[PDB]
Design a protein around this ligand. Structure first.
Ligand SMILES: *[C@@H]1O[C@H](CO)[C@@H](O[C@@H]2O[C@H](CO)[C@@H](O)[C@H](O)[C@H]2NC(C)=O)[C@H](O)[C@H]1NC(C)=O
Ligand SMILES: *[C@@H]1O[C@H](CO)[C@@H](O)[C@H](O)[C@H]1NC(C)=O
Ligand SMILES: *[C@@H]1O[C@H](CO)[C@@H](O)[C@H](O)[C@H]1NC(C)=O
Ligand SMILES: *[C@@H]1O[C@H](CO)[C@@H](O)[C@H](O)[C@H]1NC(C)=O
Ligand SMILES: *[C@@H]1O[C@H](CO)[C@@H](O)[C@H](O)[C@H]1NC(C)=O
Ligand SMILES: *[C@@H]1O[C@H](CO)[C@@H](O)[C@H](O)[C@H]1NC(C)=O
Ligand SMILES: *[C@@H]1O[C@H](CO)[C@@H](O)[C@H](O)[C@H]1NC(C)=O
Ligand SMILES: *[C@@H]1O[C@H](CO)[C@@H](O)[C@H](O)[C@H]1NC(C)=O
Ligand SMILES: *[C@@H]1O[C@H](CO)[C@@H](O)[C@H](O)[C@H]1NC(C)=O
Ligand SMILES: *[C@@H]1O[C@H](CO)[C@@H](O)[C@H](O)[C@H]1NC(C)=O
Lengths: 5, 605, 186
């Protein structure tokens, strides 16, 4: 899954 | 006809370098040096052969060009050392040897009185920093040592370059704190010291560098509070300090800087309430405070920052609902709030839709357990990138998304969505990355997927979005996360794995010439694997494992020469495992639990 | 894998890429793990380069030997020329070397006998000359071997793991000799 940080 | 002394120096110089340019083929038997590629006379005063695939070593005769003012040899393949005479040209004012494979170190004596620009970036230079170059080179405005192997202390010295404007020491191995003398540099407008191992507090004396426009301190080991010195930096436009151990809040003066365009303090230890005087910060367009311990509700006044275009607050410890005021975020283009304990996706979506410039939205790991809004009222006209993954969202494919015609990338994976994948999913002309994996979709796979314009014709053209934040991707919770800075960096992907789907794999999937990853594992698909899948020439990953498929593996799949990932394990297939081409590089696991016969692996009766 | 990323970027600059297969090979990244046609493992070390039938030309580079964990090298069906870099013999973890259907020249490096974990060596339809390295026999794990359609020469080994191979694998060479071949050895 793609995430952001 | 050039001077016989320069004519000779040029010949030794090129004798150690291949290939000769345009240009220099007749160098052995010509005196016409002034018209050879790169040379410029008035006596040779410039020598510029950047980006000419030059290979070999810097000749010692380079220091014999006494009238040279410019020496440019950037972007080539020059190994070994820099000859000592090059450090004594009395007229050399610009030296550019960046992007080669130069090694060794810099002499302790240098005498370049005319020098204005010194660039040794992107080489393998070793040892102590050429600080002493300021002794004889009093006119020096630019120092660039970035991307080398300089280790040891960030030593004193550069404070003697009274006129210095650009100082770049990035990506080396420097330790210690910023040396006190550096704060004398009244005219410094760039200071890059990022990607070292610098430590300690960041001194208040930075307020002395009153000419700074760009200050990059990122990726070091700094600590303590961000110094409250931003009223003394009226020209500052870019502060970058991500991946340090900074603490405390945003200082009032940073929070009030009218010049700042970009602020990036991501991956630090900042805390307390997050306040920014958006009335004062009239130039702010990019803000990245992700992975910090700021808390409270999301700030209500951010949309009062009328230029704020890039906002990243991911992985803080905010909570609650997207403030009602975000309706007026007129400038917002990229908005990422992954993993932030946000609530009410019905309200967040209903508000963010007002931001008419919104093109990328990342809400991963939020809204845990809620229901995706079905309301067809919602309109996101400019939406290009929508990642709302791992939220355990219930419901079905949101009909409203259908009118985001510019959609390029969609990730709704790791939710609890149901129903069928609607057919409009195939009408997105710019869609190239689709992940709906790990939900509970049912029914057939829609045939429109096979007709996805950006997957069939290799000439469909659209503008990629440019958020300042990067995107991360992990296949599974354990897997090392992958960084992607560019949206078009993502492989063209159709991911429908781990659902509850049935029907055939349409033959027409052979149309998708430029698909890279095709993942349908863990569904309930049936029928035969079409021979026409050989039509997907750009395939890198093809996982069909864990279905109900029957028949043989089409022997045409051998034509798939980029195919590195492949599984059809746990189906009902029978016949011979195809050999050679790409297939003998696939593990035993790729064919297990079938009625498949091999030759070296999986014998038969 | 910033060093491994560097080795592969030299290989891209030296290779000629009309179709832009290597277009995503971006060296400002801390590793080549998100580069198309390149597979990294659970520690972000490169294990596969899958560039077969990719309309590549140019020539290979010694740098390829930096990829300490490389297990599959698939560069078949291209127009790659020059010699086979003998660093390749350092790529000990290699299980597959597939450089068939190219125009490689010169000899088969003797350092290939150091590839102890190798199973597939397919170097056919190239322009190789010289003898067949008797190191090659030392490889216990060799299964598939295609040296045909070259310009090789000498007595072909039949000890060690070469006891398993037959005329199709050595066919069409300039002057090969032995039982496995059309001519007997002088
Ligand atoms: C955020 O900051 C942490 C802490 O500096 C980074 O973690 C370090 O990463 C380096 C190189 O990857 C390792 O050698 C260190 O051991 C890590 N330090 C610690 C204490 O874990 C991390 O990579 C940063 N993350 C991002 C995405 O910027
Ligand atoms: C040197 O030449 C390169 C490539 O031709 C160019 O991009 C660069 O600006 C030059 N360097 C300087 C310091 O002028
Ligand atoms: C400056 O020039 C002198 C000789 O003119 C040289 O000896 C000295 O080392 C130079 N300065 C530095 C610190 O390199
Ligand atoms: C915020 O900024 C405006 C304009 O600079 C100023 O007039 C106002 O009083 C400031 N408020 C605070 C609390 O910083
Ligand atoms: C999400 O944030 C939580 C809370 O700090 C943290 O444990 C987790 O590692 C984060 N995961 C991602 C993918 O950002
Ligand atoms: C979500 O937010 C809206 C508006 O703030 C509110 O009317 C609605 O009841 C909320 N839903 C829930 C269940 O909290
Ligand atoms: C699917 O998503 C859930 C979280 O919502 C996770 O626990 C589970 O491991 C995922 N399944 C797979 C196999 O990816
Ligand atoms: C598939 O869907 C059915 C109905 O929702 C469910 O009972 C089953 O557990 C799901 N299985 C898989 C393999 O995802
Ligand atoms: C794959 O199969 C062959 C023959 O059955 C065997 O020699 C080899 O060890 C197997 N690989 C694994 C992962 O055990
Ligand atoms: C390989 O080489 C031979 C002889 O030069 C040629 O006849 C044959 O067609 C080639 N095979 C392939 C697969 O191109």
């Amino acid at each position: 899954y793609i995430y952001t940080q | 006809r050039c001077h016989p002394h320069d004519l000779e120096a040029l010949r030794d110089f090129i004798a150690h370098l291949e290939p000769k340019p345009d240009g220099w083929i007749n160098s052995s038997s010509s005196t016409d040096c002034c018209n050879w590629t790169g040379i410029t006379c008035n006596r040779v005063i410039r020598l510029e052969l950047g980006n000419k695939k030059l290979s070999g070593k810097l000749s010692e005769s380079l220091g014999k060009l006494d009238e040279i003012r410019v020496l440019n040899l950037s972007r080539n393949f020059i190994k070994d050392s820099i000859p000592l005479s090059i450090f004594n040209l009395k007229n050399l004012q610009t030296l550019d040897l960046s992007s080669n494979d130069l090694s060794g170190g810099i002499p302790t004596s240098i005498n370049l009185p005319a020098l204005q620009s010194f660039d040794l970036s992107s080489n393998k230079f070793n040892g102590s920093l050429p600080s002493h170059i300021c002794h004889n080179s009093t006119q020096i405005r630019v120092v660039k040592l970035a991307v080398n192997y300089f280790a040891g202390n960030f030593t004193s010295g550069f404070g003697k370059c009274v006129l210095l404007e650009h100082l770049c020491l990035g990506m080396n191995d420097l330790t210690g704190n910023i040396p006190e003398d550096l704060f004398h540099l009244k005219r410094l407008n760039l200071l890059g010291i990022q990607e070292n191992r610098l430590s300690g507090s960041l001194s208040r004396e930075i307020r002395n560098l009153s000419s700074l426009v760009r200050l990059d301190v990122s990726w070091n080991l700094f600590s303590g509070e961000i110094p409250d010195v931003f009223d003394e930096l009226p020209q500052l436009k870019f502060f970058l300090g991500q991946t340090n151990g900074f603490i405390g809040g945003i200082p009032k003066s940073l929070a009030n800087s009218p010049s700042l365009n970009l602020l990036n303090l991501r991956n630090n230890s900042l805390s307390g309430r997050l306040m920014l005087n958006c009335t004062a910060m009239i130039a702010l367009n990019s803000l990245d405070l992700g992975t910090n311990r700021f808390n409270g509700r999301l700030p209500e006044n951010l949309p009062d920052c009328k230029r704020l275009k890039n906002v990243n607050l991911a992985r803080n410890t905010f909570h609650g609902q997207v403030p009602e005021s975000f309706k007026n975020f007129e400038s917002l283009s990229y908005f990422s709030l992954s993993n932030s304990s946000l609530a009410n996706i019905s309200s967040a979506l209903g508000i963010l839709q007002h931001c008419k410039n919104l093109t990328t939205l990342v809400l991963t790991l939020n809204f845990h357990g809620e229901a995706l809004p079905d309301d067809s009222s919602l309109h996101f006209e400019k939406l290009k990138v929508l990642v709302v993954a791992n939220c355990r969202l219930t419901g079905s494919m949101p009909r409203w998304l259908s009118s985001s015609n510019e959609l390029q990338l969609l990730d709704l994976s790791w939710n609890r969505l149901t129903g069928a994948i609607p057919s409009w999913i195939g009408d997105f002309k710019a869609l190239f990355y689709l992940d709906l994996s790990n939900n509970s979709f049912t029914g057939e796979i829609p045939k429109s997927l096979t007709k996805l314009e950006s997957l069939t014709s290799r000439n469909i053209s659209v503008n990629e979005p440019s958020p300042d934040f990067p995107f991360f991707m992990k296949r599974n919770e354990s897997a090392r996360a992958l960084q992607y800075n560019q949206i078009f960096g993502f492989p063209p992907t159709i991911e429908l794995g781990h659902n509850n789907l049935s029907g055939p794999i349409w033959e027409e999937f052979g149309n998708l010439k430029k698909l890279h990853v095709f993942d349908l594992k863990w569904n309930a698909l049936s029928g035969s694997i079409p021979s026409s899948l050989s039509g997907m020439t750009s395939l890198e990953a093809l996982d069909l494992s864990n279905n109900r498929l029957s028949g043989s593996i089409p022997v045409s799949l051998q034509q798939l020469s980029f195919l590195s990932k492949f599984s059809v394990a746990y189906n009902n297939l029978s016949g011979v495992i195809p050999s050679g081409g790409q297939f003998q590089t696939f593990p035993n696991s790729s064919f297990e639990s079938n009625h498949l016969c091999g030759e070296h692996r999986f014998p038969c009766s | 894998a910033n060093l491994e990323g560097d080795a592969l970027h030299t290989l891209r600059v030296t290779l000629v890429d009309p179709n832009n297969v290597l277009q995503s090979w971006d060296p400002t990244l801390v590793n080549p793990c998100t580069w198309f046609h390149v597979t990294c493992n659970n520690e972000n070390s490169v294990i596969r380069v899958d560039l077969g039938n990719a309309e590549l030309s140019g020539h290979l580079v010694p740098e390829l030997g930096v990829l300490k964990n490389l297990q599959y090298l698939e560069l078949y069906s291209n127009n790659i020329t020059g010699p086979i870099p003998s660093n390749l013999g350092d790529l000990t973890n290699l299980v597959s070397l597939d450089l068939y259907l190219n125009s490689f020249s010169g000899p088969i490096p003797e350092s290939l006998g150091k590839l102890s974990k190798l199973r597939f060596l397919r170097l056919n339809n190239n322009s190789l000359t010289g003898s067949i390295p008797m190191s090659l026999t030392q490889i216990t794990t060799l299964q598939v071997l295609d040296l045909s359609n070259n310009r090789l020469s000498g007595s072909v080994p039949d000890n060690g793991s070469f006891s398993l191979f037959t005329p199709i694998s050595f066919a069409n060479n300039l002057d090969l000799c032995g039982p496995v071949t059309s001519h007997p050895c002088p």
